[model samples]
Target: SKCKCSRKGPKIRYSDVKKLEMKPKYPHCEEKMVIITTKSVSRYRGQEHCLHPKLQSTKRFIKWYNAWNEKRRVYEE
Candidate 1:
């Protein structure tokens, strides 16, 4: 099937985090490894509906994606 191409990890692996999301790329890659969109303005797949809306009157992702986002933004202009 199209959903079995990825290796699975534990939910506890992300228990400490606060926000994230991943839209699966299903043509060549079956699972979502694409961080193409911005989430929580700062932050998964299948379990894609995980934690959201950071509080304490504040907000929150990965670092390498930061550079990617920057480049992507510039590339649009």
Candidate 2:
């Protein structure tokens, strides 16, 4: 996603995400994120929903088919 910078905080635009562009938020940040989509999710929905298959926290996958409302779903203006 494109990094929209501000004095307040950085914001991400999901549309701007690109594969292999998972750069950290800043110089010292270490969280590498890639924002994929539901259409893409539907393509692989059944595969284990874990954030990282090797990790065992289980906080990643809440449940099966417990889909989230698209950001647009909350849009009003």
lDDT values for all models: 0.34, 0.28
What is the clash count of model 2? 1
Model 2 TM-score relative to the real fold: 0.19
Best by lDDT: 1
Cα lDDT tens digits, model 2, 3-75, are: 3222112221233212212333444433542222233334333221113222333223312112223333444
The local lDDT score (0 to 100) that residue 29 gets in candidate 2 is: 37
TM for candidate 1 is 0.22
Runs of candidate 1 with Cα error greater than 4 angstroms are: 1-61, 75-77
Which sections of candidate 2 miss by over 4 Å?
Answer: 1-20, 35-77
| TM-score, every prediction | 0.22, 0.19
Model 2: clashing residue pairs? 1-17
lDDT of each residue in 25-54, candidate 1, tens digit only: 344544444222223323243333322222
